[PDB]
Design a protein around this ligand. Structure first.
Ligand SMILES: [Ca+2]
Ligand SMILES: [Ca+2]
Length: 688
């Protein structure tokens, strides 16, 4: 579909002003004026052109080449002129470079009709077939058979002047035209204005060329935003733990293994973290919160019959999560499961080059439609038990938290092959040779607008002290947000999925903050939000952008929100009864709540707390219709609230994750006393 020659069509006579760069499958190198809808009519006159690629014969014959305009043409085969009308021997299974230049002054028609022909020795002449033509090796190295060599200093195939001045791509029939940006035309039409470095084959320093990206000659799994030359395409992987089971480790000394199941099974919630002011760290990490809610009230050790000399082990179901912009194919990264500050309990590895599927951007391994991975799998004799000694086990009970630290070892890359127009995993290309340079030459933005989860993107930006990086276009904060995260601006206001930019805060590392502060001073600007178009990003900046509605822990996970926000989010009550409340609660708000406390307040002001335990707050559930039910009966012994006097109040309180207590207090109290909570419903019995 893409094979044939690469063509440069210029409006000037001397190969200086390229109007169109496109490829054509066969020897027909024509561009009809019907396809130049995005080129001003005056510039549809092509006075010169250059095509470039390779030819391969499927039968070794003596061939004679000819074109539509031999008098305006010079053609070379392997640096030999064949046109400037003679015969030349060509061998099967060998590849020959092709260059063709064309010049015609003051053409009277628009576009170009031009065909490349050959005649074999049986004297039969034909437009050269698609199967005989290949594109140039627009790579940074030649291949064994295909060498590399109209100003194109980085050899990506986009001429220096287009990369510097701005270009657009438009999708024709089965072809993609690359052309200069022209304001009056392409702005109305809504097209994206691309700039890129004429000296960087990949301007973002990733494994896909600026040309591959914008022409779709690229791994279909690469994220849509990373098809922009200025957005880095690379994987970003963390592990998601979905649940966990603890149990006592069998023991040499106890011979009987007939005893009752004494395990502890808990759901877990895992979030990708970022530890700050933004951090400079490129590590992958996630934190796991083990559910503290009711599963009587024995200690873990009492539950499992653990004496102080015993050991326990854990199993858990997990998935890998790719929140980056490029797929992984044949190596999942290695992960440490860590307890407390640095007690590694386990090393989690998958089997290299034996992945059951690719791990795509915005996706999981295994895919959610398949079973998760179990840390100790059932069909796996050699799975290492994840063990804790007794003190570690109590530490786990008290913290109810684990950390998964995942390396950046991501294996080989699927790259485009100009010889055959296919994408295939390349054993000679590895993510480890790419990531260091991506990290060195881009600004990193971490943004949580999607669903309060941290999503990192990197955007090519100038390093003022490194002359090469100096050849990239200026990247503004505003542009960065648009191309990397899909911010748009329907009314002079930058927003993300309907939320104004000013609904998110800005945080930077120390160096970046001082940089941005200087820039605002030079702009005589006091408010970043009103000059995003003028704030310039540099390589190595780190920027953290977070929904302002919420409170964040040191990991930058949303763990709360203002009383006013939580209250307002609950104001709309569909239905209330002695059995519970039915509300409409923003999915973002539900994420920051550990549960609810229900209480009846009598006439003298005394309070009966219905679900009065730190592990009994889990009384909300999300209904099949998106509405939340708060269930009064759950810890009321399956009975609706009994209100002995209509003037009594039913109060319901929301408890946020940062106010959630996860253990009995020091003195031993398992009640809700002292828990910081937020009143969100209060009505008399007669109002219910
Ligand atoms: Ca180039
Ligand atoms: Ca380039």
């Amino acid at each position: 579909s893409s094979q044939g020659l690469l063509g440069y069509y210029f409006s000037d006579l001397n190969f200086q002003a390229p109007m169109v760069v496109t490829s054509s499958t066969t020897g027909d190198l024509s561009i009809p004026s019907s396809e130049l809808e995005n080129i001003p009519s005056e510039n549809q006159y092509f006075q010169s052109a250059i095509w470039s690629g390779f030819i391969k014969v499927k039968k070794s014959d003596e061939y004679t080449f000819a074109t539509s305009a031999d008098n305006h043409v010079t053609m070379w085969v392997d640096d030999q002129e064949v046109i400037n009308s003679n015969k030349i021997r060509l061998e099967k299974g060998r590849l020959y470079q092709i260059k063709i230049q064309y010049q015609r002054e003051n053409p009277t028609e628009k576009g170009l009709d031009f065909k490349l022909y050959w005649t074999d020795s049986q004297n039969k002449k034909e437009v050269i077939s698609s199967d005989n033509l290949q594109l140039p090796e627009l790579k940074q190295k030649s291949s064994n058979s295909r060498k590399k060599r109209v100003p194109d200093r980085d050899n990506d195939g986009i001429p220096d002047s287009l990369e510097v001045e701005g270009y657009t791509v438009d999708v024709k029939n089965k072809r993609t035209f690359l052309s200069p940006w022209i304001s009056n035309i392409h702005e109305k039409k809504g097209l994206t204005k691309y700039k890129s470095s004429p000296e960087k084959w990949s301007t973002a320093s990733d494994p896909y060329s600026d040309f591959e990206k914008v022409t779709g000659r690229i791994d279909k799994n690469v994220s849509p935003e990373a098809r922009h030359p200025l957005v880095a395409a690379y994987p970003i992987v963390h592990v998601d733990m979905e649940n966990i089971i603890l149990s006592k480790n069998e023991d040499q000394s106890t011979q009987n293994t007939d005893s009752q199941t004494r395990t502890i099974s808990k759901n877990t919630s895992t979030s990708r973290t970022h530890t700050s002011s933004a951090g400079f760290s490129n590590s992958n990490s996630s934190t796991v919160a083990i559910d503290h809610s009711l599963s009587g009230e024995r200690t873990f050790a009492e539950t499992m019959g653990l004496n102080t000399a015993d050991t326990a082990r854990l199993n858990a179901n997990i998935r890998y999560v790719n929140t980056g912009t490029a797929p992984i194919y044949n190596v999942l990264p290695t992960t440490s499961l860590v307890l407390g500050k640095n007690q590694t309990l386990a090393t989690i590895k998958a089997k290299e080059n034996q992945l059951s599927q690719i791990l795509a951007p915005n996706n999981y391994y295994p895919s959610k439609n398949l079973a998760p991975i179990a840390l100790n799998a059932q069909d796996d004799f050699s799975s290492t038990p994840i063990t804790m000694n007794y003190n570690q086990f109590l530490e786990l009970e008290k913290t109810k938290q684990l950390r998964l630290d995942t390396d950046q070892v991501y294996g080989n890359i699927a790259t485009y092959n100009f010889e055959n127009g296919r994408v295939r995993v390349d054993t000679g290309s590895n993510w480890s040779e790419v990531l260091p340079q991506i990290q060195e030459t881009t600004a990193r933005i971490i943004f949580n607008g999607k669903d309060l989860n941290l999503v990192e993107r990197r955007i090519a930006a100038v390093n003022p002290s490194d002359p090469l990086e100096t050849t990239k276009p200026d990247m503004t904060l505003k542009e960065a947000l648009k191309i990397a995260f899909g911010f748009n601006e329907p009314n002079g206001n930058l927003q993300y999925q309907g939320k104004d930019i000013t609904e998110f805060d800005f945080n930077f590392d120390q160096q970046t903050s001082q940089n941005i502060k200087n820039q605002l001073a030079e702009l005589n600007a006091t408010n970043i939000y009103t000059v995003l178009d003028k704030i310039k990003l540099n390589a190595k900046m780190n920027i953290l952008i977070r929904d302002k509605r919420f409170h964040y822990d040191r990991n930058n996970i949303a763990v709360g929100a203002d009383e006013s926000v939580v209250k307002e989010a609950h104001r709309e009550v569909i239905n209330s009864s002695t059995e519970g409340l039915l509300l409409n609660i923003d999915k973002d708000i539900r994420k920051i709540l550990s549960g609810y406390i229900v209480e009846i307040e009598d006439t003298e002001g005394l309070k009966e707390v219905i679900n009065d335990r730190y592990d009994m707050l889990n009384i909300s559930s999300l209904r099949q219709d998106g509405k939340t039910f708060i269930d009064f009966k759950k810890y009321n012994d399956k009975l609706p609230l009994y209100i002995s006097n209509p003037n009594y109040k039913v109060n319901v309180y929301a408890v946020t994750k940062e106010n959630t207590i996860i253990n009995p207090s020091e003195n031993g109290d398992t009640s809700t006393n002292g828990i910081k909570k937020i009143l969100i419903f209060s009505k008399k019995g007669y109002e219910i």
